[model samples]
Target: MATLKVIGVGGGGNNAVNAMIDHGMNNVEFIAINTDGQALNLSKAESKIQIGEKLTRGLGAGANPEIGKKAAEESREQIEDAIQGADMVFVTSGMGGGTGTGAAPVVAKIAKEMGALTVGVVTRPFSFEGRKRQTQAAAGVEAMKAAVDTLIVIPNDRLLDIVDKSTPMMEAFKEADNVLRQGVQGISDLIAVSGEVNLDFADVKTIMSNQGSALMGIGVSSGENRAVEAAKKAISSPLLETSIVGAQGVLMNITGGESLSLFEAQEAADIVQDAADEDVNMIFGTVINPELQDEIVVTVIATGF
Candidate 1:
């Protein structure tokens, strides 16, 4: 059986652990790494495959970039351990401190070194978190992009509406985790599960990293298998990956233009499954503008590796 590995690389605190607990994805392995050894000890989730120590401080652990570097050096071993024997790896963190900021790229480097397909599911620090954090997060994001095959960025700003308008870190963090999970699942389905047109992760990754940014517009037709056929047509077209250099995520969609029915969606999925190879990693997709077009459209974003 194929295995998916998710490593929570951050040095700041418990939010990362809490997020995993909320998602409740027990099948996929979860590990937490941070610069502060004490922080690792403080983590409540024992089921985590591993809890590694960071050499330096995360946010409050130490001064700035220097600590980040130290943390990376410290967590190198655990990062390597987590990535081994994995077909794909997801590095999760919202950090700018020593560990999350610096060590994440280091982790990606290690995974790639092991020949694993690495994608970073990075969360940026909230603007209100302070300029220093933002700066560190920005730097980390750029660095990870340079090292990893793909980087899927989730900005805290986008989560404003995603979470309940409330205070306290737990609820907001949970909401963010849910959103990330949904996104990952949608993309995973495109790649891992059968779709109207299947694109394996390596090929899809290549297309996203190298192809033009081809925007997908799904159109579903009524009748027995019209929706599925429409989806196949959408997938079979020669896709141009426009502006898809180092894609952050897949732009997923579902449509019922021309008064299409749910059967069409199922048909499209069947068609997609039948066409593409079975190794793609479609993280997650959601439909936003239902009435924008008269069909089901799923747009993919990618940049050449």
Candidate 2:
């Protein structure tokens, strides 16, 4: 059996990761890493690690990236133990904070060194958070990009487009959490479960490792023509700002029942290709579940964005 692990670093990261667990992502092992023990205690992760005891003494880094870096370095062994033996690891964080901005890259580097395909799912600070935080997040993002196999960046400013103007701050953050949860669950399903026409970890690695950057989107539909409708929904996802055309790589996964046909898969791929460049590289996989015989789910991971 393949293992998928998700590590949430710092406060914001921990919240997002816990949201996934609370939403029924049972196949994933969740770990929380933080400088404050009190905050760590609140996380529902299966494992928790408190970092930089001597430096922060369980008090957090006060938004200092250098202190966060030292703290992670000091607790290197704990980080390694949490990630060991996982087939794939997702590192979740919100950039611009002390711990997440600093330690996320370190976690990615460690996971990679331990032979896990590492994916960084991170959110940048909102514009209202100030230019200083934005600058800090940008540096953190660049560092994470260099360390992880693929980096999925969610800009906080874009959340405005998805949520209603009257939505509360927490509710708005929940919207972003939903996007991450869907994406992580989709990838987890792809690699951990066998499909009728399966995609293994190797297939995912081939696409992710070769990519510069990646965007993950998921869409589901029921009733007739679900596959085609799901494909359209995925391609039109608001999470993706880049045009599908001229994309260098794409990996599409379809989940349905035994009734799922080769023709449906072909049509879904065709619809996707029409939106993408004619010469784009594409890989498709399918999973079957009888319960979803009348429904279809489409998950797309596009790279070179």
Candidate 3:
């Protein structure tokens, strides 16, 4: 069986953890890293490990930017170990505080330095979370601009419009996680499995990086599968197909409130087969939710040829 090494690290709350639990499909091993470790605590996956200090008070939703960077440097040994055993590494976190926002890049920097292809699945802070932290999150994201080959960004503000405001946070979170998982499944299913056609990392990376070339996104209604169809459409087009055939490193992600199904998520791979047969190098991606909407958002990024 083909092997892919993936590490899931994040902050903000249990939302990221909730998403990962629902999205943890076959083959991909998950490791949770956080400042507070709440997400780590809530994780259902056995491959869970916490990074940084567990915050007692949720003063800031994410990690401490300064401490995060330090922790990342400290976790180098573990990160290297996790990645050394696999062909690719996937790093995840939603920026805003210290750990996920600050440390994750440090980790990404390490992954790249070790010559491991790395991709980050990051969730942007919601508007209601306050502009200060939101702005800080934006800055954190900017700080990470050049770190990871591709950063799959999901916005929390976008999810609120999908589910009712009064809806329980967990229910909202569940919806968001489902959609994000669907997106992940879409990409992984295509590249990981090939009964007749083979899709590899090189092509996956190219298609993912297409986001940087000609940025793309998808939005589906509560009862519709437009997001899934949109993802397929993007993959099938010659423009994206050419890019997929060229990918050297890649990551896929979903954010927001779409009621995503495991089967729908897996179908994504079918669409990726057309171009991935040429060559594939590596992949990194994640599933995230903000408990607000029933839609899917997709993004792809690549290193310029």
Candidate 4:
């Protein structure tokens, strides 16, 4: 069995955790941490923690990263307890606000100290949110990058290309949350289950540990030639902007049916390499599921780009 945990910090992070749960991510622990008592009360995380009750008086950090950091430090015991014994830890947050921006890096640091391969998944503030928020988020990202094994940064401002401006604010946030959900769920699936061609935690850690930054995307296809199609789709995904030529290492996970053939697997690998820099390190694994006999799902995580 694989051990993995997802910790959501602050309101936006908690919201993304809920979205991932609703979308069917399983076989991992979910933890939510917040300075606001109301937000903690509303979260459905398996483990919910309210930090810095005395400092913030249960109100919130009010966009102050210092307060968020202090709260997390005060709750060190509880935070350590939540991440203990996990082989991998995913710290999800939306940078800018007090708790998410300040506390997230602290949590990642703890996980790293405990010997877990920690990955930080964070979203920067929307451009319209103002320069102050953006600068705060940038500082938070730098803090997290120093602590975590690999950091995946998603800029909320870029969502404009994917979502119509006329879309309701709530719907737009949900869309952003879904982007996170896909990335988390894809990696969880890759590690939790055994694939026909196995890629385990050691393989992942070898590539991600100390890699700095990474690009992740997922794609699915059905019918004949699904493996080839899915590979192309994953490589072409708009979510991944880093050029393949710039990548130092690649990790690919494919899920398919019993009908999946050696030729299909090779073809998928070939497609990925064709788009990647010559001599780049590449690793891939596949899961065979009877239910997906005619379908194929591909997920790619590229590092050092």
Candidate 5:
């Protein structure tokens, strides 16, 4: 069991951690870091750290990335303590959402400098979100790209295509949280439990250790052609690029009940391959779950696109 952790770095990051915890991940340590003391209280993470406590006074960063970065700078030692010694780390944050946008990059840098195979799963919230917000998001994402091994850019624009109001749910952000939930669970499950086929840290590190824009998506389906449907849905999420044609590596996992046959699984893998780059380095795993009698779940991740 390799030591792994997910460090969610600000207000948005805290919410992302809550989603991961609610989804019930196993074997990975969850640490939520933020500058707001009250916000930390709302997180379901195993470890809640209030960074820049002296600076923010627990109020928040006033939607300022500059203050956000400074907060991270102030807590450098604490950040290292939370991330050091991990075999792998997934840093989640939201772009255009000030504090997280700034804090995430700095938080990720600490993890990378410590030698962890760090992956930053970030989002660019839609609605411009505004010129200022977009610029900040771009700058923050740029900082994150330089700080991590691979940066999975999940755009939150699908929500605009998904809803019509503030509606309190922000299906846009929630959808983003769910996508991240599955991404983290996929890797944790691979190492925590033994499946028909296993993908250890080596497999994950291979695809993400050093790469450009990366994305991970999951799809679940049940019916006449569940495997095919799930595979198609997995690689076609509006949250991602929909095509991994230029990717250098891909990792796929298929889960089903006893009804899952080699041909069905193999066919699903082939279906996903059609959208990937020619001669890409692709690897897959299968998990036979007794309880998944009629449902099939497919997960896909591609890097260096």
Candidate 6:
């Protein structure tokens, strides 16, 4: 019985929820939190709440982390009630202004305190947004790093590696949410369903809380050597600007047909190991879907300095 709840805090955080809701992934409840009523109304999540109403006047935190944190404090009771009873929590935010930068950390702190395994995905501001935002976003990331069990920081600058300069603005923004979307789906599916090689939340907990940064890579292919091909692709994260070579821990999941039995899955897992530390503490799950005719998909999540 694995229960997962994803809460998006602030404007950027709410965007992840809205996008994920539109593209319904695995089974999990979604919530949107913000200081501005207008912004919250635009979110399509199952639940929406506006915090620090009296202080922000339903306007917004307007880039003040203090305002963002205080808003969550002002409405702590309601926020806590909304998040209560979930075994796993994901808090997504865009860290720069009041709500995203300030308020999100407070919400994450609550989730951890309530005994939920809290993970966070946050984005830093773009260079064009100015220096003050850079400083504010860093502060938020610092707070979030300590607040959540595992935190993934996506620099808006990283978008350059994935998108062409002429890419549409909206499409570009959505691309930044790619890692969080995959992360939520990967972890949720890992625990919610078991296969020939089983992995539960405790396995996830062991790898995720190892005091290191996180990296995610996914590979998909069909036909000859598909499993190994997918394995090779899954260990290289295009957005990371780094390698998984020294990662101390990894959590991997493979989904395929009978061709990917436990034996084949282990072959894929070994290929993944070829990319990381020799003694890497690893946990994995193999999910066989008969419907997948000629394709195999691999997902790798690792934590390293």
Give the alpha carbon lDDT tens digit for every residue of 130-210 in model 5.
778778888988999998998877776666676666645655577778777888777777677567987677888888887
Q: Give residue 153's lDDT in candidate 3 (0 to 100).
A: 61
lDDT by residue (1-305, candidate 6, tens digit) is 77789999998899888888888875789989999899898888878889998997899988889999999988888888988888888899998888989889999999988888888888888889999999999999999988888887888887777787788878977877877787778777777776777778887777776254677667899888888898888876655534678777888888888766666677788887777756777777788877778899888888755
TM-score, candidate number 6: 0.93
**Candidate 4 structure quality by residue, lDDT tens digits, 162-279:** 7775878778777667666776667777777888789887888887898888767777998878878898877664532244556768898888888878898888888788777566
Structural similarity to truth (TM-score) of each candidate: 0.62, 0.93, 0.63, 0.92, 0.90, 0.93
Global lDDT scores for all candidate models:
0.54, 0.84, 0.53, 0.84, 0.80, 0.83
Better of 1 and 4 by TM-score: 4
Clashing pairs in 4: none
Off by over 4 Å in 3: 37-39, 53-63, 195-197, 209-305
lDDT of 3 by residue, 1-305 (tens): 33444455554433554565665577666666655654567666556545554433423334357777766676678766666655445566667866777777777677667665566656677777787778878877766656766655656665676677588877765554543454455545545544222445666555543232212223333336644664554443221212454444334443334355556554543434334453433232435354546665444433332
Stretches of candidate 1 exceeding 4 Å from the true structure: 11-14, 42-60, 161-169, 187-199, 202-204, 207-305
lDDT (10s digit) by residue, model 2, range 66-146: 887888888899899988889888899989989999988998889989899888888899899999999999999998999
- RMSD of every candidate to native, in Å, equals 8.9, 1.9, 10.0, 2.0, 2.2, 2.0
lDDT of 5: 0.80
Question: Distance from true position, residue 242, model 3, in Å?
Answer: 19
Q: What 10-residue stretch in candidate 2 is worst by lDDT?
A: 237-246
Model 5 quality (TM-score): 0.90
Poorly placed runs, candidate 5 (over 4 Å):
164-168, 241-243
